[PDB]
DNA sequence: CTCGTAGAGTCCGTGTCAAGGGAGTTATTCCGGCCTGACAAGAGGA
DNA sequence: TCCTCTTGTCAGGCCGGAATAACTCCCTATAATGCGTGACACGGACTCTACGAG
């Protein structure tokens, strides 16, 4: 509804088409947060298992 | 001229007259404020003033 | 930090100016004293004559007109070639005389810097080769460092230390053949390095030590002067403090301008330093305030127009 | 979109900082004032951060979408989506190693306790008031012993060699790199087996825990001092044109400008062999600039140009009330709402 | 047998919340002209 | 009768000189010299009390 660009556009198209699904993605504010903390000497990475 | 127009324009005590009722004008002109430069702050205030 | 250094009064300033003069003159004579710099002088003077160079790229005024320079460099070529043929005592005196006549010339700073740098890099190569050869020797042949000093030191060119070290018949002396090729090939290579020097293998030491002395002297004198005039710099700074630049940035730019002025200052004209330096300190401060002030930097002429 | 979990935090190593960054931002210029295209290679740079407008290079040779991985030969800008200009990071080469404020000034000074040296001492070291003996060989002086100006002079004059001491954040980094975590940890645990005093024991435990965690995590102490400084993507500190010709910029642009200026001036001053006093002043100012950049609020309050309000540094930008401004209160405005 | 040290306690202070003059050189926009594709109308073949 | 193949001539993108801007090297010569609430909790320093070791 607010910060996910791709999600919001895809949901606009879905609503217009008469389908109701969703695609959350990563909130843009959180991406900004990553970049802002990484601007310091702090390594913050999204790990995987 | 800079200092004078700064005071008159960009100051806490220089504010838009609320001009919708004659009462509003007269009461606004006869007002006494404890804020501003050389005066109290809302967080400062206290409860005895 | 500025408060510690007291005011270097007038006669002190003239004193340090004489010391600076002495250092610069010493180093200039020192340049004069190796026969591979006049090679480049004459080569680029001809460049200038053949029109492959510029008349302002080589000299900045003589000492006691194109005619005079052209004739002096013609006779310079003549004397150079005759003393090169007569190299084989006599060569030392003729090199001294050539250096004394060349003292007349003053080169614009970049070329003098380039010549001091070429002589610096040749001495650098000498010292680096000697250090690497002695490293290989002492570490692979286990060369005792006292015999190292006594025997190796002095020539760096002859085989006396080579053949004496191998002659001591010591067991590490026998392993010395393991790296005899490298050591003696480096000795020969060094001999050729000094064949392109040409004088000998001790005057390299003399020149580097004399140059270091002159440079250190000059640096110390300028250090004294600058620390004495920091107060002047800060005094002049007070005007520009409120042009959106920081106070200390201003003082630093003023320091750089004062350094330049000190480097270019001549006391012999007989005027007090402060008035002369003011010009460079203000120039630097103004240029920096103009340049580092605005976010969207604006050329200096446009600022002057504003 | 990846399916992730477990977000990991660690000190960034200098080679990682080089790893993220695509180019070095050497000059402080921002934009051309005539044509407001970004200057290369300034704080706003297309060849480093990204193309200004979608799928079109700076100089304007390549404009078709058909070109997307070509890198314009005149302007070193790759032709791609403008959105990339929101994530690409830069970096700055710092000439003098500078200390990281967070790891120094936070009430528990982790450099200090790692070095078991009080804060005031480290302060005296960084500001160039006294030296510290980094491996002082076979002499009568310890490894974390401070020497004052003229004590260092009498020592140097008497002790020319066998004596390694330095000043400033680079000295701190050098001595920090040399400390043997494992041996000191073993010493401290031996103290725990032998030492019986309440508060001393407690402090000992604290130190032990710190060292243990530090050596297990795999972070090397020397990284606490920064050599390369990353620079946030331009779009997050934009320089958007207000209507009517006036411009608006976040303060980070100004702080970065100041840092780059002082760094360049220090480079030049070093190349010139300037007197020691001035280089020392230069290192002090650079430390100041960095400390304003990382966490503004722990010093003499560097105000901004003509605005009286202290400029907002990264730390302020992260921490707010409460904390996460847009992620935490308040609070992410939302579409499809009315009142 | 006596003294200094160790431990405990209290008070204070900090972080965190509620002066431009210029000569030479190159860059960049701007007008003028060359060089290769593309567009129009009709005709011929299936 | 309808669809396809053909002869022929213009135009737009690209490049060159010019003219107004910019950036560095000349910048210099009397002397000027320091100036810019408030409650909480925790940690550190100082003091007091009591014990163990030489
Ligand atoms: C610095 C100034 C802040 C003004 C401010 O903060 N006023 C606060 C006024 C508050 N009051 C007087 C109206 C009272 C309160 O709102 C109500 S109460 O008294 O507190 O109850 C900013 C904010 C809007 C900015 C202008 C706009 O961009 C348009 C335009 C763009 C051009 O390119 C450059 C010029 C213009 C005129 C800008 C100028 C300037 O850059 C302005 C005024
Ligand atoms: Zn391009």
């Amino acid at each position: 509804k607010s910060d996910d660009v791709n999600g919001r556009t895809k949901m606009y198209k879905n609503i217009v088409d008469g389908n109701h699904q969703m695609e959350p993605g990563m909130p843009e504010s959180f991406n900004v947060l990553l970049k802002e903390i990484r601007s310091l000497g702090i390594n913050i990475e999204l790990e995987d298992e | 001229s800079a200092a004078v127009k700064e005071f008159f324009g960009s100051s806490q005590l220089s504010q838009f007259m609320d001009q919708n009722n004659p009462l509003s004008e007269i009461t606004h002109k006869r007002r006494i404020s404890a804020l501003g430069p050389g005066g109290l702050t809302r967080e400062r205030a206290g409860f005895e003033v | 930090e500025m408060g510690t250094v007291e005011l270097l009064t007038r006669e002190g300033e003239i004193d340090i100016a004489k010391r600076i003069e002495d250092g610069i003159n010493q180093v200039q004579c020192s340049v004069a004293e190796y026969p591979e710099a006049i090679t480049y002088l004459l080569e680029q003077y001809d460049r200038v004559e053949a029109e492959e160079a510029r008349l302002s790229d080589l000299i900045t005024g003589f000492v006691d007109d194109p005619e005079l320079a052209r004739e002096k460099f013609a006779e310079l070529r003549a004397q150079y070639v005759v003393t090169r043929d007569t190299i084989k005592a006599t060569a030392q005196e003729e090199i001294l005389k050539l250096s004394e006549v060349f003292k007349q010339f003053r080169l614009v700073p970049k070329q003098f810097d380039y010549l001091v740098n070429s002589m610096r890099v040749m001495m650098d190569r000498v010292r680096t080769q000697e250090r690497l050869i002695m490293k290989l020797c002492v570490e692979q042949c286990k060369m005792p460092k006292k015999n190292f000093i006594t025997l190796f030191t002095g020539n760096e060119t002859s085989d006396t230390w080579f053949n004496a070290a191998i002659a001591m018949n010591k067991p590490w002396s026998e392993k010395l053949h393991d790296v005899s090729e490298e050591v003696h090939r480096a000795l020969q290579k060094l001999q050729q390095i000094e064949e392109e020097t040409g004088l000998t293998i001790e005057q390299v030491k003399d020149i580097n030590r004399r140059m270091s002395i002159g440079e250190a002297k000059a640096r110390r004198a300028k250090k004294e002067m600058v620390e004495a005039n920091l107060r002047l710099v800060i005094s002049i700074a007070k005007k520009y403090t409120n042009r959106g630049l920081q106070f200390l940035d201003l003082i630093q730019e003023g320091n750089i301008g004062l350094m330049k002025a000190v480097d270019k200052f001549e006391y012999r004209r007989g005027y007090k330093f402060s008035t002369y330096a003011t010009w460079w300190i203000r120039q630097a401060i103004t240029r920096s305030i103009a340049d580092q002030a605005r976010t969207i930097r604006i050329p200096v002429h446009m600022i002057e127009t504003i | 979109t990846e399916e992730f979990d477990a977000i990991k935090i660690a000190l960034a190593s200098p080679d990682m900082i080089r790893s993220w960054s695509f180019g070095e931002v050497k000059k402080p210029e921002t934009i051309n004032y005539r044509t407001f295209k970004p200057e290369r290679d300034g704080l706003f740079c297309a060849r480093i951060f990204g193309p200004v407008k979608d799928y079109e290079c700076l100089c304007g040779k390549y404009k078709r979408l058909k070109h997307r991985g070509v890198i314009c030969e005149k302007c070193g800008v790759e032709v791609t989506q403008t959105k990339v200009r929101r994530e690409r990071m830069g970096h700055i080469e710092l000439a003098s190693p500078t200390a990281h404020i967070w790891f120094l000034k936070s009430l528990p000074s982790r450099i200090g306790l790692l070095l078991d040296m009080p804060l005031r001492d480290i302060e005296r070291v960084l500001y160039f008031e006294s030296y510290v003996v980094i491996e002082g060989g076979m002499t009568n002086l310890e490894r974390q012993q401070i020497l004052t100006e003229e004590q260092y002079l009498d020592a140097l004059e008497e002790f020319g060699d066998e004596f390694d001491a330095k000043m400033g954040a680079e000295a701190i980094q050098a001595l920090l790199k040399s400390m043997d975590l494992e041996q000191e940890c073993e010493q401290l645990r031996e103290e725990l087996n032998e030492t019986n005093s309440e508060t001393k024991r407690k402090k000992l435990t604290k130190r032990i825990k710190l060292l243990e965690a530090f050596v297990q995590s795999g972070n090397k102490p020397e990284w606490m001092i920064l050599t390369v400084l990353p620079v946030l993507p331009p779009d997050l500190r934009p320089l958007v044109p207000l209507d009517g010709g006036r411009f608006a910029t976040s303060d980070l642009n100004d702080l970065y400008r100041r840092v780059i200026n002082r760094n360049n001036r220090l480079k030049r001053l070093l190349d010139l062999a300037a007197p020691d006093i001035i280089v020392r002043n230069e290192k002090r100012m650079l430390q100041e600039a960095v400390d304003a950049l990382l966490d503004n609020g722990r010093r003499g309050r560097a105000i901004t140009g003509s605005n009286k309000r202290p400029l907002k540094s990264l730390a302020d930008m992260i921490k707010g009330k409460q904390g996460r401004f847009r992620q935490n209160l308040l609070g992410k405005r939302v579409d499809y709402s009315g009142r």
Side-chain angles (χ1 to χ4, degrees), chain A, chain B, chain C, chain D residues 1-320 322-325 330-331 333-339:
Chain A
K1 304 278 286 295
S2 70
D3 304 304
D4 178 16
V5 290
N6 316 331
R8 85 160 68 108
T9 63
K10 295 149 93 179
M11 176 160 276
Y12 196 77
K13 263 175 290 293
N14 283 120
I15 301 301
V16 165
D17 279 331
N19 174 8
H20 300 84
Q21 294 175 347
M22 188 172 64
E23 277 92 0
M26 182 146 298
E28 185 64 28
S29 66
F30 185 68
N31 208 20
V32 170
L33 179 70
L34 275 80
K35 289 301 176 290
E36 179 158 330
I37 293 178
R38 197 183 298 265
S39 158
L40 291 160
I42 317 296
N43 180 12
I44 175 154
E45 60 179 324
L46 276 56
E47 189 202 28
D48 201 48
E49 75 275 15
Chain B
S1 172
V4 71
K5 63 190 297 212
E6 186 98 10
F7 166 74
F8 285 160
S10 84
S11 172
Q12 189 147 359
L13 320 180
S14 173
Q15 38 179 359
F16 269 62
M17 171 156 63
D18 53 347
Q19 191 176 186
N20 52 1
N21 219 341
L23 195 41
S24 159
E25 306 179 356
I26 301 299
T27 199
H28 192 190
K29 292 160 169 179
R30 299 158 46 86
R31 174 158 283 151
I32 316 293
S33 164
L35 313 188
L40 279 298
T41 304
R42 295 141 42 161
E43 312 98 21
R44 206 260 189 272
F47 271 35
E48 287 315 344
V49 55
Chain C
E1 300 306 3
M2 59 83 65
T4 189
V5 291
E6 307 306 2
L7 321 168
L8 173 84
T9 68
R10 178 185 179 121
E11 290 77 335
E13 88 172 2
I14 295 93
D15 202 38
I16 62 169
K18 321 304 211 52
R19 308 206 307 278
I20 295 175
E21 263 177 352
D22 173 317
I24 185 51
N25 290 117
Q26 187 165 341
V27 59
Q28 284 186 355
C29 310
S30 300
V31 176
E33 188 179 352
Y34 70 101
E36 193 40 53
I38 308 103
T39 65
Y40 176 81
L41 312 176
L42 59 88
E43 286 308 353
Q44 276 190 168
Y45 195 77
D46 296 359
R47 289 298 173 282
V48 163
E49 304 278 326
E51 284 214 333
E52 297 176 353
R54 188 77 303 163
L55 324 171
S56 69
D57 263 353
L58 306 181
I59 302 88
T60 186
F62 284 103
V63 179
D64 61 274
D65 73 284
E67 298 173 20
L68 177 41
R70 283 184 290 113
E71 59 182 9
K72 185 81 213 96
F73 278 84
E75 61 199 359
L76 185 63
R77 188 65 66 86
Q79 184 67 10
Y80 184 110
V81 289
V82 295
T83 67
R84 197 184 55 191
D85 281 306
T86 63
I87 174 175
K88 200 275 178 162
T90 181
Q92 286 70 32
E93 283 146 26
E94 287 166 14
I95 292 317
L96 297 170
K97 194 187 60 172
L98 192 143
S99 56
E100 290 149 51
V101 299
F102 161 89
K103 199 189 188 45
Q104 302 209 346
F105 304 169
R106 299 183 298 173
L107 284 73
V108 72
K110 178 39 69 178
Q111 292 69 244
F112 197 72
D113 289 317
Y114 183 76
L115 303 204
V116 59
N117 185 351
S118 297
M119 171 204 173
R120 185 54 44 66
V121 62
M122 57 192 94
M123 184 64 204
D124 298 357
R125 282 192 47 190
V126 180
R127 185 181 306 112
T128 55
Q129 185 194 21
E130 68 95 7
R131 297 297 169 77
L132 61 79
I133 198 185
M134 60 77 88
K135 289 296 296 176
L136 270 300
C137 280
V138 289
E139 282 321 333
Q140 194 271 1
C141 305
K142 187 250 195 183
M143 206 184 205
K145 294 300 180 297
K146 315 326 187 76
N147 300 326
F148 187 71
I149 302 293
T150 174
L151 190 69
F152 178 77
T153 306
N155 55 77
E156 304 70 40
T157 180
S158 87
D159 59 32
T160 190
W161 55 267
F162 185 78
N163 55 55
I166 308 173
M168 319 284 157
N169 220 27
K170 294 297 96 168
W172 55 268
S173 173
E174 317 274 11
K175 298 81 193 163
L176 196 161
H177 291 289
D178 300 329
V179 294
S180 88
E181 184 272 2
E182 59 91 21
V183 56
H184 211 84
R185 190 297 295 281
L187 197 49
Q188 300 296 109
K189 181 178 287 293
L190 186 53
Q191 292 171 330
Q192 316 307 339
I193 296 183
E194 297 305 319
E195 299 327 289
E196 299 155 45
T197 308
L199 179 39
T200 191
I201 299 83
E202 304 75 55
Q203 47 81 31
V204 304
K205 303 297 187 289
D206 300 0
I207 58 164
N208 69 13
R209 62 102 181 187
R210 205 165 63 177
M211 297 181 71
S212 310
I213 294 178
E215 182 273 0
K217 187 135 178 53
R219 214 209 50 61
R220 297 184 189 92
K222 287 162 266 309
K223 194 186 178 180
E224 302 328 327
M225 180 168 171
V226 302
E227 309 158 353
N229 286 131
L230 307 179
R231 316 185 199 278
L232 181 150
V233 158
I234 184 178
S235 62
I236 185 71
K238 308 183 286 287
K239 305 290 191 294
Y240 302 102
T241 79
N242 260 314
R243 290 83 199 273
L245 191 55
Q246 292 297 110
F247 189 75
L248 285 83
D249 300 64
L250 297 148
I251 309 164
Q252 283 297 315
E253 291 294 38
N255 292 335
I256 306 183
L258 170 154
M259 294 151 188
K260 191 42 72 174
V262 168
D263 192 74
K264 217 168 187 157
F265 162 79
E266 319 285 3
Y267 76 101
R268 292 181 62 250
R269 190 159 281 94
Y271 290 163
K272 196 169 188 190
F273 177 69
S274 158
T275 178
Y276 176 41
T278 299
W279 279 124
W280 290 86
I281 291 164
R282 202 141 71 161
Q283 161 63 57
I285 277 161
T286 42
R287 185 72 99 85
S288 158
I289 179 52
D291 205 306
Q292 275 146 39
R294 314 286 308 278
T295 302
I296 307 96
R297 189 185 63 78
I298 299 92
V300 308
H301 67 80
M302 187 80 85
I303 302 167
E304 290 184 19
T305 285
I306 275 170
Chain D
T1 174
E2 56 205 327
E3 286 293 87
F4 66 93
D5 43 351
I7 319 172
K8 184 155 289 182
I9 196 156
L11 300 96
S13 87
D15 298 351
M16 261 178 92
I17 304 283
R18 284 166 192 173
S19 88
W20 308 320
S21 184
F22 293 99
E24 203 179 334
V25 301
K26 300 179 177 202
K27 287 223 195 197
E29 303 152 350
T30 48
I31 64 166
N32 213 32
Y33 85 87
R34 192 190 291 300
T35 51
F36 306 145
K37 294 178 287 174
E39 297 304 336
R40 55 173 300 166
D41 50 358
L43 262 172
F44 293 84
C45 188
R47 79 177 293 279
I48 294 163
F49 295 117
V52 188
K53 195 208 284 186
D54 272 350
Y55 291 151
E56 76 168 10
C57 79
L58 192 45
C59 66
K61 210 194 166 194
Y62 306 157
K63 293 281 168 74
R64 298 326 296 170
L65 189 154
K66 78 169 178 179
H67 319 92
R68 55 157 175 182
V70 55
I71 44 171
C72 194
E73 55 279 345
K74 320 316 187 315
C75 59
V77 310
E78 70 179 1
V79 59
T80 317
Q81 200 150 357
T82 189
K83 74 181 179 194
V84 71
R85 190 175 174 82
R86 190 171 179 99
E87 311 150 354
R88 293 192 190 262
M89 287 181 97
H91 75 288
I92 311 182
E93 288 285 29
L94 277 179
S96 173
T98 183
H100 191 101
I101 302 302
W102 275 5
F103 302 128
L104 181 163
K105 195 64 68 204
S106 200
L107 181 154
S109 69
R110 301 175 143 83
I111 45 177
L113 56 84
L114 178 55
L115 279 171
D116 75 319
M117 195 46 42
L119 198 42
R120 274 222 81 170
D121 197 14
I122 318 304
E123 176 205 313
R124 279 172 231 181
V125 187
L126 312 172
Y127 297 165
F128 299 85
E129 293 66 14
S130 303
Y131 298 85
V132 183
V133 194
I134 301 89
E135 189 200 325
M138 284 73 74
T139 75
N140 57 297
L141 283 86
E142 205 46 23
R143 167 190 199 270
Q144 313 187 4
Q145 158 172 17
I146 56 157
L147 279 56
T148 188
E149 184 61 18
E150 74 281 343
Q151 268 182 318
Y152 175 107
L153 314 175
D154 72 20
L156 187 153
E157 66 86 23
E158 206 280 356
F159 288 101
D161 198 348
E162 68 177 317
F163 201 61
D164 290 318
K166 281 178 176 295
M167 203 158 255
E170 60 164 327
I172 299 297
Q173 158 186 3
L175 63 81
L176 213 51
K177 188 283 171 181
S178 65
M179 74 168 57
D180 186 342
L181 308 172
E182 199 63 59
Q183 161 63 32
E184 183 170 311
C185 188
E186 293 323 328
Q187 207 282 346
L188 295 205
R189 295 180 287 265
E190 172 279 337
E191 296 273 80
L192 266 162
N193 319 93
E194 180 80 68
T195 56
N196 285 329
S197 305
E198 179 58 11
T199 58
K200 174 213 58 199
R201 268 197 55 85
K202 275 160 38 155
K203 312 334 198 171
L204 163 58
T205 78
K206 170 197 312 195
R207 285 258 316 174
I208 284 188
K209 177 80 160 298
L210 282 290
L211 269 286
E212 292 181 278
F214 207 72
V215 61
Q216 182 50 231
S217 158
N219 295 142
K220 290 194 289 171
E222 71 248 40
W223 295 344
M224 202 96 68
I225 307 301
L226 313 185
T227 305
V228 289
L229 185 56
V231 294
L232 193 70
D235 277 293
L236 302 161
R237 38 170 183 78
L239 178 46
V240 71
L242 269 192
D243 51 28
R246 198 85 169 243
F247 278 165
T249 181
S250 182
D251 300 348
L252 314 173
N253 301 94
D254 175 61
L255 274 179
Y256 278 159
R257 195 196 53 239
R258 186 188 291 176
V259 167
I260 308 182
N261 287 311
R262 298 168 157 186
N263 189 23
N264 284 321
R265 180 162 67 260
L266 192 147
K267 270 170 178 69
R268 187 174 54 248
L269 266 194
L270 286 201
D271 185 351
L272 266 67
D276 58 54
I277 300 97
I278 297 170
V279 311
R280 284 172 180 161
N281 203 10
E282 199 57 9
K283 270 161 205 66
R284 260 183 292 263
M285 287 171 318
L286 181 139
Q287 200 55 33
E288 198 54 3
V290 161
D291 179 332
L293 192 142
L294 314 162
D295 184 8
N296 180 18
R298 296 171 184 268
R299 300 299 183 184
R301 302 302 81 190
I303 304 299
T304 177
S306 70
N307 205 16
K308 290 150 283 184
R309 192 149 309 107
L311 56 84
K312 195 180 186 186
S313 191
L314 287 164
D316 262 358
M317 187 179 288
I318 307 150
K319 75 161 285 293
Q322 298 190 172
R324 302 318 153 85
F325 266 100
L330 289 61
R333 308 262 183 176
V334 311
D335 292 328
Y336 307 109
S337 89
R339 69 164 169 188

